[PDB]
Amino acid sequence: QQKIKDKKESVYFSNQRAPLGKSHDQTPGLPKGLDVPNTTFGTAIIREL
Amino acid sequence: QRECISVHVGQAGVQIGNACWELYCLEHGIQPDGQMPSDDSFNTFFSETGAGKHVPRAVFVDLEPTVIDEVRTGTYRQLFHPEQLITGKEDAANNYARGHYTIGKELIDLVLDRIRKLADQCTGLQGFLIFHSFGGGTGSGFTSLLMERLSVDYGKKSKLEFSIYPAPQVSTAVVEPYNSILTTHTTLEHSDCAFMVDNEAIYDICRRNLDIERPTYTNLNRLISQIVSSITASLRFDGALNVDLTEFQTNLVPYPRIHFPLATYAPVISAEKAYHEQLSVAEITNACFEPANQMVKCDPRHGKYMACCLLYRGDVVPKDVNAAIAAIKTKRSIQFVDWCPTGFKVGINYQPPTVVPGDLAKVQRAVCMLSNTTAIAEAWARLDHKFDLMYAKRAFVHWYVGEGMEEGEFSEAREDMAALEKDYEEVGMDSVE
Amino acid sequence: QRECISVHVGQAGVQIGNACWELYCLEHGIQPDGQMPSDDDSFNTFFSETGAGKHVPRAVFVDLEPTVIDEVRTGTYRQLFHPEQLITGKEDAANNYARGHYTIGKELIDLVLDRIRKLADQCTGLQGFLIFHSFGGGTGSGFTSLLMERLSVDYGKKSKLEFSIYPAPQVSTAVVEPYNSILTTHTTLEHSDCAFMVDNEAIYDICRRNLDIERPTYTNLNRLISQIVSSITASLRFDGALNVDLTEFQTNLVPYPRIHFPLATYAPVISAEKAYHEQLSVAEITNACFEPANQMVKCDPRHGKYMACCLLYRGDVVPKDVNAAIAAIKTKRSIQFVDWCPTGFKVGINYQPPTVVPGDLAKVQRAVCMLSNTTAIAEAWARLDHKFDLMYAKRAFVHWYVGEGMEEGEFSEAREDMAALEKDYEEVGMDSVE
Amino acid sequence: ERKGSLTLRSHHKKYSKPVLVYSWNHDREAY
Amino acid sequence: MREIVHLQAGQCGNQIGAKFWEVISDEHGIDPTGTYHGDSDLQLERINVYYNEATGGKYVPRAVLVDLEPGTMDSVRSGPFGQIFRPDNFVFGQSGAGNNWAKGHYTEGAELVDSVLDVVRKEAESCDCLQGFQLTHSLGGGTGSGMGTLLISKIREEYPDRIMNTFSVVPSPKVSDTVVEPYNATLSVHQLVENTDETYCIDNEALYDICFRTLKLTTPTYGDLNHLVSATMSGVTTCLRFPGQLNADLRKLAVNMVPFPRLHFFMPGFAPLTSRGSQQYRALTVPELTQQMFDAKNMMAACDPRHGRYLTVAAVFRGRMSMKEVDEQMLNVQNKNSSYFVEWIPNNVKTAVCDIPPRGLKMSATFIGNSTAIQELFKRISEQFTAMFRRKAFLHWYTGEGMDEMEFTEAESNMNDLGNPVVTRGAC
Ligand SMILES: Nc1nc2c(ncn2[C@@H]2O[C@H](COP(=O)(O)OP(=O)(O)OP(=O)(O)O)[C@@H](O)[C@H]2O)c(=O)[nH]1
Ligand SMILES: Nc1nc2c(ncn2[C@@H]2O[C@H](COP(=O)(O)OP(=O)(O)OP(=O)(O)O)[C@@H](O)[C@H]2O)c(=O)[nH]1
Ligand SMILES: Nc1nc2c(ncn2[C@@H]2O[C@H](COP(=O)(O)OP(=O)(O)O)[C@@H](O)[C@H]2O)c(=O)[nH]1
């Protein structure tokens, strides 16, 4: 817990834009409820007829 | 039926295999234990025994412990057959002499016996994918010995290499020019196709396109694992242009010696960078030929592409690729050699790329671009210069010559690479006759 | 089909485009987020169709300094712009044209052109480029010139218009506007096919004497500029009786290959509790265009001859009260023309009424932005010329440029090209006697 | 290396009733 | 009756033939289960041209499916009309062709060709009056190019009096789907030119020009492309399959479109082709059928008819139709663009009318052209071969499988000995 509170006090820094094994704590740059593991990306193919 | 055998040598080879197999289990549906939670797509890389407990076709051999012990102690302990995991008791210690001559013989019979045993339950064998670097002593000398003995025993089979190219600016060792020069001199006559992968370029693409300022080798190996799964996708699922390893061999290399392609991957894009793109086939084709998604740090416009093999994976219409290659072949930044009017080998698979819990994104499309080009000549020549300056006054030669290697192997390797540079220049020169 | 790419450079260009894209997102049905709320093709010009309808724009926002684009990426419209169409620098151009063209800037021009390449690749018919620069700083002058050069080299023959903020006749903000403006005009006079100007003090006056606000600020100015830009590009977006295109502007407004400098004049600038009392008919709003106080540049047009005007009516404008009003303006003897150009007043009419941002402008059913090429702007060019002469009489502020790496002699050909522009303006202003 | 049905052969095919064979006249005679 | 033995070589040939046994199966009313569920009694009268029968009314195709890799085979079995073929006829082999004509013709291709000939001997001895063999294959790549031309050689050697039809796809100028397509196409055509009687060169770029310009589609798939192939590849054998006035079998198609034995390369074309956006505005009649035939957009070979003179035109029409229209319209064509038809062959245009249109249409037609325009394709492939053969490139696997230097030069000389007669006809 001393390490958990240490990193909670330390998440005010450049640590949030350079996480040790992550990217950005990506969530504020997506829609609110989105389910990032789901929702395949890009434009799908419509395939009319 | 259409299977391939994976070999993993060295620290790099073992952790690349770790990433590749944790990708393959998620790709198929196999849990880390081995039981699939519940039809024939598995058969290429995963063998099947009683009580449905699917096992990889991989030989993990490394001459020093604790790295295989991570594998056989961690979560994927119950997936691998422990007699595949081959451990020595002495680290090769960045010496090709210790990789090829002294501690290669106590373990080469065991690893070849296991390779033969996996060849036994293989009806039509397509070939080998051997995973290493050009760095440490294990992944240099032991893979040189493996390519020699495998060319001896399975000479008609296709043998392909996944080699971590030594980083041209940082390095992780000071004898990397020696080790790389020796392993490529002794695998040039036996390797059929050697996919180069760098570390500098994967750091750069992880900072630019993956948006991680703090990446580790887990992320690095996950990107390389996506490359391996992308080229070995037609052997696994069905597709439009079902491509083969022998077809890779006949397309990616014109001459008997010019067999060092470069691998690139498109959608390397990282969640809050792809909701704003259509991810259409044209722009994901352009991303391969842009000079920043190259995964080997050599500049393409200072050279000419010999042959490009494009591997489209997922929902790809078979003819936006036609429009994209048509758009590419009119441009001037991408230059082809004059003796190769044809330039492309297109393969299309209908399986979308899976996402590992981690860095990359759930994209409906992907493409792996394997290019044989002349631009790798500068990459070879700079380490040839590095060899010449380090060898001009006999640095680090005493370990190599005193462990059992003769002196003349260094000179033979240097002359072989002078010949290789001369070949690159002769091929890159245009026609006047 | 009918799309064009917007490049927004400098702090002025970035803020102008902030209020701009603020206007266009409410022009169409696009949220601050980007999806259309709840449940035809007008979005295509300025927005794309990335899957499940996210609608990312076609802007490539550049700044050689931080914090200005960082407010955009951490405020309101932070979800709508792509993170890599907003490129930032780690230093400042610092009012130094040499530090917009050389030193800082050449490390970033590669990434800027690469993003421009990607957006151009995802376009079928790329109608043109729209550069929003400022003529006053370093970021909007030197990087603008470098951009103009490389854009002209790689994407040739395509229309490329600048919507710039011309330096004030007396007011200004900085001290090196003469140097910066003359230098970038010299560099970008032979590549930019056309360039409209607006002036800060003129917007101040038009917002103090029509908008009834006695204390406007940059947001208040930028909303009117956004309305001008939207009236220019609304015909490329919606349907009307006489559709006008970017290439059609590029041919109609510019007589000579060097004289490519029109001035904007937006009309109905009425102020909410003044708008219910006029008829707001077509004749009087045309009179408001050609009246020399609604001009968006502080340059008196009575000191000169009009060369070509493009009127862009939007709203429920009947096609031929335009005819009556243009004939009425033609008959007046103080709005004078060059004798060699009888056809002067160009009609574009759009069935799109103006859309009001919460702010100063009112609900108007008719609006125009009159675009005047005239030889009156030779006086403003001459006063900036005289400022440069007083500047360079004793080599003030030259040490920064020279110690950067700009050659000492470049001021001389900048001065010579400005003298050439003065001579071309005075030669095209004269009456034909042969 | 023969595989089942490729050892067994014939020199004449048998056809169903609504098939125009050579002996269409010959069997349609005797129907 | 006259049976037509069908042969599939290569992945391209297998998928094209799979769409063939889609299209003619639901033309002839054969369901996926193998029974007969039709509507008319006329559609079983010539069922003994593509389907052998088994016990209980199981109509099995007389198609021998050949591939060097057993994955396209499993794809065909898992396809819609997969459980229709003979299970013994799925002649596979656990090996790798690897897009090498040497590895398809002088190697395990020549090891599997014996079993392939055994099952073709099966299907040709169980007959009475055999007319021809059709092979679907790809000139580029292997398997279809490798064992395909080998199959042509052995089949024509051991039955020398039957028609050979080769529905072959050719490389396009815009792209290439394999970097050894020039080599494979040269070695394939060198064996095709003193063997076969009718070839059909079908180009993918021409297919996309058809699909994008005329059909107005945005996402054409391989089912789309091979269905366009299968339309003509069904339409050519329709006077032999269904009654009509001026019935013309494949053999007199051969004698009418072959003036000289080398010049037998054809450009196909199917032309009741309507976009869905213009189907309701279409006015389907024989004059517009010919006007959509002869424009330079609907031939499936990517080579331009405006750059040469036609030697022979053939039109197999399907549908109940008045042929005073047909006669006057083809005469209006022959006297309209007269310089694009050869003067030394008066009435170089053939007409064959079947009463029964394909299902879903009233009015259809397939167009077969023997013209000078194949010269452009031949010279392009010859230029690619000279460019990549001058510096010995992509060639050591060709040598290492048991080849010689002289075979490539003989193939190139045979390409030029094809180019010479097709340019002598351009200047008479
Ligand atoms: N993907 C991946 N690559 C690695 C990893 N570790 C090392 N490498 C690469 O391998 C090079 C040096 O390690 P190796 O060549 O694999 O060393 P080795 O083959 O195990 O031989 P020894 O050093 O004697 O143990 C480095 O330059 C890296 O580029 C890893 O953990 N993951
Ligand atoms: N309309 C509008 N004009 C502005 C704005 N900011 C600056 N300007 C004009 O631009 C001139 C100088 O600003 P810029 O040219 O944008 O300065 P810069 O691009 O930040 O360049 P540096 O100062 O070197 O960083 C001023 O005289 C203003 O007239 C703005 O936010 N809106
Ligand atoms: N029309 C059509 N052409 C195809 C299809 N599949 C592949 N092709 C063509 O076949 C060529 C490559 O096939 P190939 O390498 O010869 O397959 P292989 O014979 O098994 O080696 C490509 O150029 C494709 O254009 C298909 O389903 N339909």
CSV table of C-alpha atoms in Angstrom, one decimal, chain C residues 11-219:
chain,number,residue,atom,x,y,z
C,11,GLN,CA,-1.0,31.4,-33.4
C,12,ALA,CA,-3.3,33.7,-35.4
C,13,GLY,CA,-4.0,31.0,-37.9
C,14,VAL,CA,-4.7,28.4,-35.2
C,15,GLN,CA,-7.1,30.7,-33.3
C,16,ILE,CA,-8.8,31.8,-36.5
C,17,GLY,CA,-9.3,28.1,-37.4
C,18,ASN,CA,-10.5,27.4,-33.8
C,19,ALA,CA,-13.3,29.8,-34.3
C,20,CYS,CA,-13.7,28.6,-37.8
C,21,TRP,CA,-14.1,24.9,-37.1
C,22,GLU,CA,-16.3,26.1,-34.2
C,23,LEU,CA,-18.5,27.6,-36.9
C,24,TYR,CA,-18.5,24.7,-39.3
C,25,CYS,CA,-19.3,22.0,-36.7
C,26,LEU,CA,-22.6,23.9,-36.1
C,27,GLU,CA,-22.9,24.6,-39.8
C,28,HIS,CA,-23.4,20.9,-40.2
C,29,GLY,CA,-24.9,18.5,-37.6
C,30,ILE,CA,-21.5,17.7,-36.0
C,31,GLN,CA,-21.2,17.7,-32.2
C,32,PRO,CA,-18.1,19.0,-30.4
C,33,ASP,CA,-17.3,15.3,-30.1
C,34,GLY,CA,-17.8,14.6,-33.8
C,35,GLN,CA,-20.7,12.2,-34.2
C,36,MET,CA,-24.0,13.5,-35.6
C,37,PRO,CA,-26.5,13.3,-32.7
C,38,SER,CA,-29.2,10.7,-33.0
C,39,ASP,CA,-30.0,10.0,-36.7
C,40,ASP,CA,-26.5,14.6,-47.0
C,41,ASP,CA,-23.0,14.9,-48.5
C,42,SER,CA,-22.3,18.5,-47.5
C,43,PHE,CA,-19.9,17.3,-44.8
C,44,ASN,CA,-17.5,16.4,-47.7
C,45,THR,CA,-15.3,19.4,-48.2
C,46,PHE,CA,-14.2,19.8,-44.6
C,47,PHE,CA,-15.0,16.4,-43.0
C,48,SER,CA,-14.4,12.8,-43.8
C,49,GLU,CA,-16.3,9.5,-43.1
C,50,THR,CA,-14.2,7.4,-40.7
C,51,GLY,CA,-16.3,4.4,-39.7
C,52,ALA,CA,-19.4,4.6,-37.4
C,53,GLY,CA,-19.4,8.4,-38.3
C,54,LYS,CA,-16.6,10.1,-36.4
C,55,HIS,CA,-16.2,12.9,-39.0
C,56,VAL,CA,-12.6,14.0,-38.6
C,57,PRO,CA,-11.7,17.3,-40.4
C,58,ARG,CA,-9.3,18.0,-43.2
C,59,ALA,CA,-7.1,20.5,-41.3
C,60,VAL,CA,-3.4,20.0,-40.6
C,61,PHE,CA,-2.9,22.5,-37.7
C,62,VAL,CA,0.7,23.5,-37.3
C,63,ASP,CA,2.5,25.6,-34.7
C,64,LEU,CA,6.2,26.1,-34.1
C,65,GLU,CA,5.4,27.0,-30.5
C,66,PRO,CA,3.5,25.0,-27.8
C,67,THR,CA,0.4,25.8,-25.7
C,68,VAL,CA,-1.8,27.2,-28.5
C,69,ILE,CA,-2.6,23.8,-30.0
C,70,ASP,CA,-2.3,22.2,-26.6
C,71,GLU,CA,-5.4,24.2,-25.5
C,72,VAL,CA,-7.2,22.6,-28.5
C,73,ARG,CA,-6.1,19.1,-27.6
C,74,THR,CA,-7.1,19.6,-24.0
C,75,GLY,CA,-10.3,21.6,-24.5
C,76,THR,CA,-13.9,21.1,-26.0
C,77,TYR,CA,-12.9,20.3,-29.6
C,78,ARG,CA,-10.2,17.9,-28.4
C,79,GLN,CA,-12.2,14.8,-29.4
C,80,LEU,CA,-12.9,15.9,-33.0
C,81,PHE,CA,-9.4,16.7,-34.2
C,82,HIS,CA,-7.1,13.8,-34.9
C,83,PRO,CA,-4.0,13.9,-32.5
C,84,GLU,CA,-1.6,13.8,-35.4
C,85,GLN,CA,-3.2,16.6,-37.5
C,86,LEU,CA,-2.2,18.9,-34.7
C,87,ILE,CA,1.6,19.3,-34.9
C,88,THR,CA,3.6,21.2,-32.2
C,89,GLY,CA,7.1,22.5,-31.8
C,90,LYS,CA,9.3,22.6,-28.7
C,91,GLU,CA,10.7,26.1,-29.2
C,92,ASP,CA,9.5,29.4,-30.6
C,93,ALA,CA,9.9,31.1,-34.0
C,94,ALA,CA,10.1,34.3,-32.0
C,95,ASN,CA,9.1,37.0,-34.5
C,96,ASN,CA,12.1,36.0,-36.6
C,97,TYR,CA,11.3,35.1,-40.3
C,98,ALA,CA,14.7,33.4,-40.4
C,99,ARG,CA,13.5,31.2,-37.5
C,100,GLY,CA,10.5,30.3,-39.5
C,101,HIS,CA,12.3,29.4,-42.7
C,102,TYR,CA,15.6,28.1,-41.3
C,103,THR,CA,16.7,26.7,-37.9
C,104,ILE,CA,13.4,25.8,-36.3
C,105,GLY,CA,11.0,24.7,-38.9
C,106,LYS,CA,13.0,22.6,-41.3
C,107,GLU,CA,12.9,19.8,-38.7
C,108,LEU,CA,9.1,20.0,-38.7
C,109,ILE,CA,8.3,20.7,-42.4
C,110,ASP,CA,8.8,17.0,-43.1
C,111,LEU,CA,6.1,15.9,-40.7
C,112,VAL,CA,3.8,18.7,-41.9
C,113,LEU,CA,4.1,17.7,-45.5
C,114,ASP,CA,3.7,14.0,-44.6
C,115,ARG,CA,0.4,14.7,-42.8
C,116,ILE,CA,-0.7,16.9,-45.8
C,117,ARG,CA,0.2,13.9,-48.0
C,118,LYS,CA,-2.0,11.6,-46.0
C,119,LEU,CA,-5.0,13.9,-46.1
C,120,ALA,CA,-4.4,14.6,-49.8
C,121,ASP,CA,-4.3,10.8,-50.4
C,122,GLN,CA,-7.7,10.4,-48.8
C,123,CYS,CA,-9.3,12.8,-51.2
C,124,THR,CA,-10.8,12.2,-54.6
C,125,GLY,CA,-11.2,15.7,-56.0
C,126,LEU,CA,-8.9,18.0,-54.1
C,127,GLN,CA,-10.1,21.4,-55.0
C,128,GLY,CA,-7.4,23.4,-53.3
C,129,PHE,CA,-5.3,24.3,-50.3
C,130,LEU,CA,-6.3,26.9,-47.7
C,131,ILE,CA,-3.4,28.5,-45.7
C,132,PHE,CA,-4.4,30.6,-42.7
C,133,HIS,CA,-1.3,32.7,-41.8
C,134,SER,CA,-0.7,36.1,-40.2
C,135,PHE,CA,2.0,38.2,-42.1
C,136,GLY,CA,3.2,39.4,-38.7
C,137,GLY,CA,5.1,36.7,-36.7
C,138,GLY,CA,7.7,34.1,-37.3
C,139,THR,CA,5.5,31.0,-37.2
C,140,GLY,CA,3.0,32.4,-39.7
C,141,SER,CA,5.6,33.9,-42.0
C,142,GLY,CA,8.7,31.8,-42.3
C,143,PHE,CA,7.1,28.4,-41.9
C,144,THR,CA,4.4,29.7,-44.3
C,145,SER,CA,7.0,30.5,-46.9
C,146,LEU,CA,8.7,27.2,-46.5
C,147,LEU,CA,5.3,25.4,-46.7
C,148,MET,CA,4.4,27.4,-49.8
C,149,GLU,CA,7.6,26.5,-51.6
C,150,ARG,CA,7.5,22.7,-50.8
C,151,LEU,CA,3.7,22.6,-51.5
C,152,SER,CA,4.2,24.3,-54.9
C,153,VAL,CA,7.0,21.9,-55.7
C,154,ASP,CA,5.2,18.6,-54.8
C,155,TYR,CA,1.5,19.4,-55.4
C,156,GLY,CA,1.6,21.6,-58.4
C,157,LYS,CA,-1.1,23.2,-60.5
C,158,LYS,CA,-3.6,23.0,-57.7
C,159,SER,CA,-5.3,26.2,-56.4
C,160,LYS,CA,-3.7,27.5,-53.2
C,161,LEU,CA,-5.3,30.5,-51.4
C,162,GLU,CA,-4.2,32.3,-48.2
C,163,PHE,CA,-6.6,33.9,-45.8
C,164,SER,CA,-4.2,36.2,-44.1
C,165,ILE,CA,-4.3,39.0,-41.5
C,166,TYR,CA,-2.6,42.1,-43.0
C,167,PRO,CA,-0.6,44.3,-40.6
C,168,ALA,CA,-2.4,47.4,-39.2
C,169,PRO,CA,-1.8,50.8,-40.8
C,170,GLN,CA,-0.8,52.3,-37.4
C,171,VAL,CA,-1.9,49.9,-34.6
C,172,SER,CA,0.1,46.7,-34.8
C,173,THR,CA,1.2,44.4,-31.9
C,174,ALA,CA,4.9,43.6,-32.5
C,175,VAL,CA,7.8,45.7,-33.7
C,176,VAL,CA,9.2,43.7,-36.6
C,177,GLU,CA,6.0,43.5,-38.7
C,178,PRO,CA,7.7,45.5,-41.6
C,179,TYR,CA,10.6,43.1,-41.8
C,180,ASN,CA,8.5,39.9,-41.4
C,181,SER,CA,5.7,41.0,-43.8
C,182,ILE,CA,8.0,42.3,-46.6
C,183,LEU,CA,10.1,39.1,-46.4
C,184,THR,CA,7.3,36.7,-46.5
C,185,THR,CA,5.4,38.7,-49.2
C,186,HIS,CA,8.6,38.6,-51.3
C,187,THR,CA,8.9,34.8,-50.8
C,188,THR,CA,5.2,33.9,-51.3
C,189,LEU,CA,4.3,36.4,-54.1
C,190,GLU,CA,5.3,34.0,-56.9
C,191,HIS,CA,3.8,30.7,-55.5
C,192,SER,CA,0.4,31.6,-53.9
C,193,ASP,CA,-2.1,31.9,-56.7
C,194,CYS,CA,-4.3,34.3,-54.6
C,195,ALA,CA,-4.3,35.8,-51.1
C,196,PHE,CA,-7.2,37.6,-49.3
C,197,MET,CA,-6.4,40.0,-46.5
C,198,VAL,CA,-8.2,41.2,-43.4
C,199,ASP,CA,-7.0,43.9,-41.0
C,200,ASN,CA,-7.2,43.9,-37.2
C,201,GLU,CA,-7.9,47.6,-36.8
C,202,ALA,CA,-10.6,47.4,-39.5
C,203,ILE,CA,-12.3,44.6,-37.6
C,204,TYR,CA,-12.0,46.7,-34.5
C,205,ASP,CA,-13.8,49.6,-36.2
C,206,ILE,CA,-16.5,47.5,-37.9
C,207,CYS,CA,-17.2,45.9,-34.5
C,208,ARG,CA,-17.2,49.3,-32.7
C,209,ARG,CA,-19.4,51.1,-35.2
C,210,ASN,CA,-21.8,48.3,-36.3
C,211,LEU,CA,-21.6,45.6,-33.7
C,212,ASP,CA,-22.2,48.1,-30.9
C,213,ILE,CA,-19.7,46.4,-28.6
C,214,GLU,CA,-17.1,48.8,-27.3
C,215,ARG,CA,-14.6,46.2,-26.1
C,216,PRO,CA,-14.2,43.4,-28.7
C,217,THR,CA,-11.5,40.7,-28.3
C,218,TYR,CA,-9.8,38.0,-30.5
C,219,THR,CA,-12.8,35.7,-30.2
